């Protein structure tokens, strides 16, 4: 069995050296050490920026939040048009309407006024850096595992559960294949019946999932995809118009 030896495709800074990870397999219980992969140090050995993780984690948690809480003001509560009793003479407190916020059943003075949006956008480069940092942190704390593929001998979830327990993978595992359509049917069958082992395509990777799961599993094709997408942000001009429109060298 020839080792699976992955080299980094994109040029590495001369002053830096690649970091490495065992290439593994899910085809048997002991099929660790199937190879050795170089990883780009700028993606997998960047400065550990936990403050940037918090920035990106909070942007994910909040940027799509729409609040639907709403109260009625004194203007919107039913009725309440007339002055309850004369300004002077009664010996009562003076009141203009029975739906003032002082009255039971009155309006709310400074209540929620939804629907309220919380949309904002961290700069693209910050969002790309948060992805690198999460990857660097997973590797550095021995929570990253590179596989050659996600193929299983069976689609039985207990196997994947037992395999993780044997390899000491933690309670939650995040499986990243390169593409949704081209996922092995076996890993699809196993993870669909599980709650803490979650299968996603490469395009769905994010800081919140990587932090929620203890263990991160990446196929080797995924690694090349990630290095390419994230290192592109380091070398790009400022845009002239949205990157969705045609450029000379983009996409690929």
């Amino acid at each position: 069995p020839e080792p699976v030896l992955r080299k980094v495709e994109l040029p590495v800074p001369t002053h830096r050296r690649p970091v490495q990870a065992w290439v593994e397999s899910l085809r048997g219980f002991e099929q660790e050490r199937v190879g050795l992969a170089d990883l780009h140090p700028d993606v997998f050995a960047t400065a550990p920026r936990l403050d940037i993780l918090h920035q990106v984690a909070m942007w994910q948690k909040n940027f799509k939040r729409i609040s639907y809480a709403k109260t009625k003001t004194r203007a919107e509560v039913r009725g309440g048009g007339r002055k309850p009793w004369p300004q002077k003479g009664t010996g009562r407190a003076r009141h203009g309407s029975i739906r003032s916020p002082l009255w039971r059943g009155g309006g709310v003075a400074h209540g929620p006024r939804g629907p309220t949006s919380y949309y904002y956008m961290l700069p693209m480069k910050v969002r790309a850096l948060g992805l690198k940092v999460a990857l660097t942190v997973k590797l550095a704390q021995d929570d990253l595992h590179i596989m050659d593929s996600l193929e299983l001998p069976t689609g039985d979830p207990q196997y994947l559960t037992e395999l993780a327990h044997y390899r000491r993978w933690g309670d939650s595992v995040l499986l990243v294949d390169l593409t949704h359509e081209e996922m092995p049917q076996s890993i699809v069958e196993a993870t669909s019946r599980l709650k803490t082992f979650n299968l996603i395509p490469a395009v769905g990777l994010n800081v919140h999932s990587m932090l929620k799961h203890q263990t991160l599993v990446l196929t080797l094709p995924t690694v090349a995809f990630l290095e390419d997408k994230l290192l592109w942000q380091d070398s790009r001009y400022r845009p002239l118009y949205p990157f969705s429109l045609p450029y000379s060298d983009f996409p690929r």
Partner: protein, 134 residues
């Protein structure tokens, strides 16, 4: 329904390709002599043998920036520092002590790999980091 007649062509499409911009900053061409007329030098190869490293920016310049707050706080920032940033600080202290007549006031931000100096020293620091191989 009569329509104006047209003719498709693929020969002239080279003229459209010449109009598309790139997303990737081009790497600088090779020059027979350095510095270039504009004054640009490439980093030294092999990288200098120092405890710290100063990476160039995406446009291939030395990352020394002057900064200002309150309308009067002149500051120079050195960014993109790798390795031991406390060694870089000592060197900048020794480079700028003669020029100031005293030790410069500095902030070392280990987290961001940034050195901050009180005062404008962008030109001196650029020329000095460029003579180091960075």
């Amino acid at each position: 329904p009569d329509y104006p007649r047209f003719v498709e062509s693929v020969d002239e499409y080279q003229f459209v390709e010449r109009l598309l911009p790139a997303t990737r900053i081009p790497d600088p061409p090779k020059h027979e002599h350095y510095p270039t007329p504009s004054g640009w030098q490439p980093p030294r190869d092999p990288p200098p043998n120092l405890p710290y490293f100063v990476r160039r920016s995406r446009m291939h310049n030395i990352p020394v920036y002057k900064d200002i707050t309150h309308g009067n706080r002149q500051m120079t920032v050195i960014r993109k520092v790798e390795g031991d940033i406390w060694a870089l600080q000592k060197d900048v202290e020794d480079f700028l002590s003669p020029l100031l007549g005293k030790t410069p006031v500095t902030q070392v931000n280990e987290v961001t790999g940034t050195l901050r100096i009180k005062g404008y020293f962008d030109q001196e620091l650029k020329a000095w980091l460029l003579e180091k191989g960075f």
